[PDB]
């Protein structure tokens, strides 16, 4: 008999079984579990989102990349589960490592020496190297996006908004406090620089333990934002290649910029010097992933020859913004054959 957890079908035995509830989403519930097979423990992510576009966007996405990547700081998938006819394929199953903890349920328990902060950002750092080598954008950084465990190693989850860099986008997106300014403003946003606002963002929460700019809203997010940067310069303004959004920003309040270590008293300076070059308001300016890895905060960690890069650049061999949920669908499944028995 098909395992249930909390009223709903996990359909993945004989192989997986003693199935516990960890947590659930807008469109699933993941579960741990024990593969009888391999003999170890997994993470097993129940999805449904064929009734919805997005959903199924970001199912397809995941799929595609994490098949791809193999890093240690980026989870892996282990095996997929689905039916064996399409039109019977309501739900796919996600089998990846189990993690013990995200950084976000972390940070709501605990408070992270300078020690664990370091740490944490240059694993951060490296598995982004691997991503960018890739040309690859993951464009949801957040806390609840990094996996943890006992070992203290971390790794990016979560790739549904990745897409391909290349200097309106219909999406689900759960938040927008990670979001760099060119996204809020829509000016070429398919920069590698808006993973590194991102990441400078979750520094920043990670000094503090509360999120930099929370915002309520679009606009107030924004806000958030100017509020401490202040108000852009003239060279900052003249980056934002969307006239329209320009014509706002000049409408807004002058705003003072706060001072670093105002925020943040406490903190490592070279912590906070890190962060002013990572969320600096002109993305031709912020600091790049490989700079990054290379800053006096993290020099007890920078080894280049063991922080590897992908053989070659990522492509989706096909566009897949406007894509139909029903051809979405389809490519699921064909993603999703090569784990059925019998495939081609
Ligand atoms: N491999 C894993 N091991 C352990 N826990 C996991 C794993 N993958 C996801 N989780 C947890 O499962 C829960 C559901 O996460 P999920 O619904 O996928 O959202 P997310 O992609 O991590 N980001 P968010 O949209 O903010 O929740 C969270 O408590 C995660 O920490
Ligand atoms: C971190 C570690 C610890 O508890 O870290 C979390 C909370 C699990 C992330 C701990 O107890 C000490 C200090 C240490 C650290 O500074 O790692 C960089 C390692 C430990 C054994």
């Given at each position: 008999?098909?395992?249930?957890?909390?009223?709903?079908?996990?359909?993945?035995?004989?192989?997986?079984?003693?199935?516990?509830?960890?947590?659930?989403?807008?469109?699933?519930?993941?579960?741990?579990?024990?593969?009888?097979?391999?003999?170890?423990?997994?993470?097993?992510?129940?999805?449904?989102?064929?009734?919805?576009?997005?959903?199924?966007?970001?199912?397809?996405?995941?799929?595609?990349?994490?098949?791809?990547?193999?890093?240690?700081?980026?989870?892996?998938?282990?095996?997929?589960?689905?039916?064996?006819?399409?039109?019977?394929?309501?739900?796919?199953?996600?089998?990846?490592?189990?993690?013990?903890?995200?950084?976000?349920?972390?940070?709501?328990?605990?408070?992270?020496?300078?020690?664990?902060?370091?740490?944490?950002?240059?694993?951060?750092?490296?598995?982004?190297?691997?991503?960018?080598?890739?040309?690859?954008?993951?464009?949801d950084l957040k806390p609840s996006?990094?996996?943890?465990?006992?070992?203290?190693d971390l790794k990016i989850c979560?790739?549904?908004?990745?897409?391909?860099?290349?200097?309106?986008?219909?999406?689900?997106?759960?938040?927008?406090?990670?979001?760099?300014?060119?996204?809020?403003?829509?000016?070429?946003?398919?920069?590698?620089?808006?993973?590194?606002?991102?990441?400078?963002?979750?520094?920043?929460?990670?000094?503090?333990?509360?999120?930099?700019?929370?915002?309520?809203?679009?606009?107030?997010?924004?806000?958030?934002?100017?509020?401490?940067?202040?108000?852009?310069?003239?060279?900052?303004?003249?980056?934002?290649?969307?006239?329209?959004?320009?014509?706002?920003?000049?409408?807004?309040?002058?705003?003072?910029?706060?001072?670093?270590?105002?925020?943040?008293?406490?903190?490592?300076?070279?912590?906070?010097?890190?962060?002013?070059?990572?969320?600096?308001?002109?993305?031709?300016?912020?600091?790049?992933?490989?700079?990054?890895?290379?800053?006096?905060?993290?020099?007890?960690?920078?080894?280049?020859?063991?922080?590897?890069?992908?053989?070659?650049?990522?492509?989706?061999?096909?566009?897949?913004?406007?894509?139909?949920?029903?051809?979405?669908?389809?490519?699921?499944?064909?993603?999703?054959?090569?784990?059925?028995?019998?495939?081609?």
């Open positions: 008999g098909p395992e249930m957890v909390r009223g709903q079908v996990f359909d993945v035995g004989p192989r997986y079984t003693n199935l516990s509830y960890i947590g659930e989403g807008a469109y699933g519930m993941v579960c741990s579990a024990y593969d009888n097979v391999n003999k170890v423990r997994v993470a097993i992510k129940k999805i449904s989102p064929f009734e919805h576009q997005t959903y199924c966007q970001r199912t397809l996405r995941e799929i595609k990349i994490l098949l791809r990547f193999r890093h240690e700081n980026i989870i892996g998938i282990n095996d997929i589960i689905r039916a064996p006819t399409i039109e019977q394929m309501k739900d796919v199953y996600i089998v990846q490592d189990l993690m013990e903890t995200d950084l976000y349920k972390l940070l709501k328990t605990q408070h992270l020496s300078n020690d664990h902060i370091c740490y944490f950002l240059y694993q951060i750092l490296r598995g982004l190297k691997y991503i960018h080598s890739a040309n690859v954008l993951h464009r996006n990094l996996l943890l465990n006992t070992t203290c979560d790739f549904g908004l990745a897409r391909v860099a290349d200097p309106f986008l219909t999406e689900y997106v759960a938040t927008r406090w990670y979001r760099a300014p060119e996204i809020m403003l829509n000016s070429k946003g398919y920069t590698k620089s808006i993973d590194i606002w991102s990441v400078g963002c979750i520094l920043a929460e990670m000094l503090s333990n509360r999120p930099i700019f929370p915002g309520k809203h679009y606009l107030d997010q924004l806000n958030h934002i100017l509020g401490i940067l202040g108000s852009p310069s003239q060279e900052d303004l003249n980056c934002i290649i969307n006239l329209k959004a320009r014509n706002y920003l000049l409408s807004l309040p002058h705003k003072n910029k706060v001072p670093w270590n105002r925020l943040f008293p406490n903190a490592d300076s070279k912590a906070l010097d890190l962060l002013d070059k990572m969320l600096t308001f002109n993305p031709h300016k912020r600091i790049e992933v490989e700079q990054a890895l290379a800053h006096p905060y993290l020099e007890q960690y920078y080894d280049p020859s063991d922080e590897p890069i992908a053989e070659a650049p990522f492509k989706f061999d096909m566009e897949l913004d406007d894509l139909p949920k029903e051809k979405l669908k389809e490519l699921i499944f064909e993603e999703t054959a090569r784990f059925q028995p019998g495939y081609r």
